[PDB]
Amino acid sequence: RVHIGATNLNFAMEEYVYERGNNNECIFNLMKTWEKLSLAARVIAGISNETPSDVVAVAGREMAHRASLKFMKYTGCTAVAGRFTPGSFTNQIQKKFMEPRLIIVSDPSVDHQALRESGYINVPTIAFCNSDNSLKNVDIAIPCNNRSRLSIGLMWWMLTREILLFLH
Amino acid sequence: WTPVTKLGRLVKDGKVKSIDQIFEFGIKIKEYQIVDHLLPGLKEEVMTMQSVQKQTSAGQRTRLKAYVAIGDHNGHAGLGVKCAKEVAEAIKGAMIQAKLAMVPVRRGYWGATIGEVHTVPCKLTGACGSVRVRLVPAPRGTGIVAAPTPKKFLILAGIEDVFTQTTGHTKTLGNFVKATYDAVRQSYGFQTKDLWKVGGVKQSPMDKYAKILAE
Amino acid sequence: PLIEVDLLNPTAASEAKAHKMKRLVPTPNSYFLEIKCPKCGATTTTFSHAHRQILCQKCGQPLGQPTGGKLKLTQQCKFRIKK
Amino acid sequence: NKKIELYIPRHCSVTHTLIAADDHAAVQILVPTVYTVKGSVRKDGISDHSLNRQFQKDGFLKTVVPKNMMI
Amino acid sequence: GRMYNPGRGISRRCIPYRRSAPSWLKTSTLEVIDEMCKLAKKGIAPSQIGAIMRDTHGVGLVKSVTGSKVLRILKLAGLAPKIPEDLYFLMKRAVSVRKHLEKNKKDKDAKYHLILIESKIHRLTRYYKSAKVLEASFKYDANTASAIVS
Amino acid sequence: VRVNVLADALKSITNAEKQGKRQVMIRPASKVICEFLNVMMKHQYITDYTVVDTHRSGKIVVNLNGRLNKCAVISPRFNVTLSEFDKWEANLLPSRHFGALVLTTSYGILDNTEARAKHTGGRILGFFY
RNA sequence: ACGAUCAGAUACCGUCGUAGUCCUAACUAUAAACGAUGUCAACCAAGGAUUGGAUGAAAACCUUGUUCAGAACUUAAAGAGAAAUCUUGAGUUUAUGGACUUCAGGGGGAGUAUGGUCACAAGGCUGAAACUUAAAGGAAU
RNA sequence: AUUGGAGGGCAAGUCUGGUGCCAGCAGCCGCGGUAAUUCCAGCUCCAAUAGUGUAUAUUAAAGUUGCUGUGAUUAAAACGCUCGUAGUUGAAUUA
RNA sequence: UUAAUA
């Protein structure tokens, strides 16, 4: 049920949304989901092939913790599971000053802190956006469901496969 | 020494030979020692020493706020602000902040391409608080026609000739320098006619040397 | 709007949604139609948004009632669009 | 003698405007070609859609942007 | 917006992009003129005359069939009223408000709106005199308009 | 009420470019509006434009390409003598190589550069950087 | 006018109570008459809801799609401003010019004196000067 | 070789003798109540120089009179509101 | 309930 989105639709996801469902839920275009995902995976694969550590995947919500952690295993990109410390991208004296060249976020609505810091460090961002999410400070958006456990695990596992057990 | 960021490591290894490369790709400078390497022998000039005060139960807490301007005389300038309890340290603290706040200064000619570049290319306006500073291109002979406070800054940036028209509470020393730094800041952001050409494709130094920095 | 569409080739659906004046080339939403009479076979041509009682030319099975924006044709009156 | 310009500034691939040296929100996306997005576009919530037009123009996507938007 | 109040409505008509008569229309100018001619003799305003043709005869635009407007047609037949239609209806409302005001002296909103109506009349009368429609000897008077409007 | 249609058009174009819009629409079209756009095209400030006919002083759609910083009209069109040119350019234009005025003259609507070449003054319309 | 309270209380508290409060006719023409934001016109970021219509679907009332007009509200890393804050502008302004009208020039003296005019009157409209003074004032910590 | 000054605006003394909220200096902020960087003097140097101070007025500074060019929510300032003449400004369109 | 001033 990755195609099924939320009820309220953002103006930036109107293109991806195909037609509202029976009880007023947005239904994403499957081909557009794959087309965006393949493009995003290609961008990640291009950067990560030389230096895996410069791709950072954060996952605030609890049903995205496990999926992101395996993505770290099978690609080497650094993954952030718990809360995102507000300044880990800008405070160089901090001992966990991690520098990305690309950021992947499970949800803009939850991981807004990682997204907003990307406007300070000249780093493009990639997000798994739902029909209600705000498309700010992201550059490649994957229109999908990012609340249900099945969709969160599948999309991360699908993304991991294209770059080259996930369910929370 | 002992770099922490990539750009810090790259300049210490001597791989980014020019500050203009950093400005080209809009990379933030987070170590003042980077500017020291790429722009040696920077002239220095302290604008003012304004003392602020905070009321407390036991009295007042006086701190010294320093506005220092830095920049080589060949098109680079920087303004930094720092406040502390000691004049000596506040200058040093503002000394650091001025270096990370380096900005390119685009300058051009007045009527013909003869000689070297002396004056601003077009009309620029600073956008500080009530103070607003306008810079106009001027012929070769005229010096920096400005108040002493922005004349001191404009001298460092390498602008030999300019016309100025200020507006607002210019008695505010801090905003007066800040307005000049703002007009200079957006010189390279104003798209004139000569900048229409897209030019060629250049490689970012953080992508070409991404492998070595990891290793 | 932040997202922008072509201003020279609007879609058929997009033009239909817009106000009758705010289209690319403004067009009326009204039309001319004829109504076959319930009483006889004659067809009386009239405006879609008529502002008066519509009578047949034969008799007068009144065929429509003007109601603030569109004719309220009787349930037994069949019409077609005059092109 | 010496070159009169410090450097040739980059041009945003969306709005075709210069990228200021202080624009710390401007990104650069490498698609294995170079795409530059100005910081103002990103903060507005449109850079995702603008790149879709440019990606579709270069062929990286085919059935994302509808025809009436393909400008 | 409206001349006298802050209301702002855009309720308009939309002439189609076809200056010629539609294909399905077959009545010639002779029937259109005489049908319009008979309506004018019945004491009907030119604005209402065109509506009757549109609703009943399907002649929605007369300029698309005859090539000349309704008022031009009526002037040629000599059936155009001496007082222009828009000015005539304005003086009909000023008379009606004034009659109500004779018995209801305390109505302060009717006095305001009567002032607005009469200001409109002096605006239209001035224009029509520059357009030579009304002779310069014409002048609107309350003691006189009750009879001519009637 | 609409006093200056050209003022409305140039404000629409400037507003569109500040937002980064690709193309903009101008509802009332005029000869003067078309001439002003033609001058701006000859300097390659706008890609092109098309004029739709609505039988009601139709609309104009202008395509913009990241180059028009600001185009503004000048209120009452002062009678610009040939000796008053450089006084106007010194006030309205950023420098001596970048922008161009627009003047209406008996030889048509021309910018300051070729009006100087044709040796003719006239009323000033506007400018663009 | 009494009675309390208080050092006193011509006030706050309590009791009584004239003009007034109400209607008709005629004056008066002033309010923190405030959105402290002149009138007209163009462009203009995301929304959810509401009042009155038009138009499809779903059997006047109600739930939804579109669109016109009205009083509003929320978000903004954007625009502006001294900031508070404004966004149906207080935006599009040193990159200064869409049209027109009214008003202001440090604080007092002072909306005072005099002159003119309106009113039965109180008062209203117009309205200074001498002299005095380095500040008065606005938003925020 | 003189005139004015040496706290700040504004280049120049935290030198020494007297004076003790007095005399006074002070265009403005202000300094002086006994240890005065500002009074009165001595020495020194600061500016200009056969000129240099003072007083009144014009101009610039003043984008503090605005055409270029101001401000009107809260700093001063949108008529209580509408109608209205003069005045000002007025849609596209003609080979 | 009452509570003024420096």
CSV table of C-alpha atoms (C1' of nucleotides) in Angstrom, one decimal, chain B residues 125 132 134 167 190, chain G residues 81-82 94-96:
chain,number,residue,atom,x,y,z
B,125,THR,CA,23.2,49.9,-2.4
B,132,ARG,CA,21.8,52.8,3.4
B,134,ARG,CA,25.0,53.8,-2.3
B,167,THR,CA,21.0,57.7,4.0
B,190,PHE,CA,24.0,41.5,-9.8
G,81,G,C1',10.4,48.1,8.2
G,82,A,C1',13.9,51.3,13.7
G,94,U,C1',18.5,55.1,-3.8
G,95,A,C1',17.0,49.3,-9.1
G,96,U,C1',13.7,56.1,-6.1
